[PDB]
Design a protein around this ligand. Structure first.
Ligand SMILES: Cc1cccc(C(=O)NN)c1
Length: 330
């Protein structure tokens, strides 16, 4: 089997991407945020505290003939941006792009934090990191990909995120028409539950390539590119007027400035992030100060290849017995 679904930015800045997901019988279609940095599939639901729901589409398990309470199960998750959600669990049929899993753990939110309430476009998350990060207790549950894996033609999924445009998640196959050149594969550590790998270095604009190991995660659920402070300083030093602002919480620049590209290494291969990808617009409406898409990972504890980086590439998440990551230009 295979599946193929279109993923769509939620706003004009590509702050996140939503993918339609069919849950239950008859199908309830929810728009979920596919997140290779977490491992819970959770949704706004009929059980979510009423005051915390504002425009989201909800899953109602009582209306699904295939929904079964996972008795005694609870879940509770906190994300890197300080947001959080929690609730109980049902198993139900879940389909993505024609690929169907039965008995998928669907985590029903009883509580979500303010940032989820305030974003009407995201109806929940679909985690695609390793199942060892799943928060369901007392019995940890498997991700959609983990459950689908044995049935897939090939044990892989791919992320092809668009720049200010729709893209694609495929399951079970590699679309050889979706990238240029070759796919370069690189080693993955699963020890922290993430798609964790080591970049071979970077360059800024037309600058020479600095060979240096940068350990980080491929994380579709994170908007920006977070790298060591040395690397980020070297990037913004090439942008006239750029400054790190403690009041804003990162690097900002005048948008009258032209942004250089940023290149990262994948083995001997190179992925080039165009300068325009690194522009996240005015810090507040009407402001001439724009927020940077490359920020310091200092204090996060880990480097994060988020959407800014991944949308410059065709990315293979290879879930073979020994997992690997593949990157191609496109
Ligand atoms: C590195 C890290 C730490 C905490 C949460 C996340 C996550 O959920 N990413 N989408 C990632």
């Amino acid at each position: 089997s295979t599946g193929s679904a279109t993923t769509t930015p939620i706003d004009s800045l590509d702050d996140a991407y939503i993918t339609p997901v069919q849950i239950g019988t008859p199908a309830q279609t929810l728009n979920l945020d596919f997140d290779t940095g977490s491992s819970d599939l959770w949704v706004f639901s009929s059980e979510t505290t009423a005051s915390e729901v504002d425009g989201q589409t909800i899953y109602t398990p009582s209306k699904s003939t295939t929904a079964k309470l996972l008795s005694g199960a609870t879940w509770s998750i906190s994300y890197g941006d300080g947001s959080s959600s929690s609730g109980d669990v049902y198993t139900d049929t879940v389909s993505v792009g024609g690929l169907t899993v039965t008995g998928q753990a669907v985590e029903s939110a009883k509580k979500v934090s303010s940032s989820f309430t305030e974003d009407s476009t995201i109806d929940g998350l679909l985690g695609l990191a390793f199942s060892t990060l799943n928060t369901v207790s007392p019995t940890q549950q498997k991700t959609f990909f983990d459950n689908a894996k044995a049935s897939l033609d090939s044990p892989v999924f791919t992320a092809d995120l668009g720049y200010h445009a729709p893209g694609t998640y495929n399951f079970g196959f590699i679309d050889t028409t979706a990238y240029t050149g070759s796919i370069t594969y690189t080693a993955v550590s699963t020890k922290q539950g993430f798609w964790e790998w080591t970049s071979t270095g970077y360059a800024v604009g037309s600058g020479t390539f600095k060979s240096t190991s940068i350990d980080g995660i491929a994380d579709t659920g994170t908007t920006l590119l977070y790298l060591p402070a040395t690397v980020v300083s070297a990037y913004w030093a090439q942008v006239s007027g750029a400054k790190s602002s403690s009041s804003v919480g990162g690097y900002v620049f005048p948008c009258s400035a032209t942004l250089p590209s940023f290149t990262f290494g994948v083995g001997s291969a190179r992925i080039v992030i165009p300068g325009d990808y690194i522009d996240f617009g005015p810090i507040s409406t009407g402001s001439s100060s724009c927020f940077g898409g490359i920020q310091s990972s200092a204090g996060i504890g880990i480097n994060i290849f988020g959407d800014v980086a991944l949308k410059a590439a065709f990315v293979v998440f290879n879930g073979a017995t020994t997992p690997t990551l593949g990157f191609a230009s496109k």
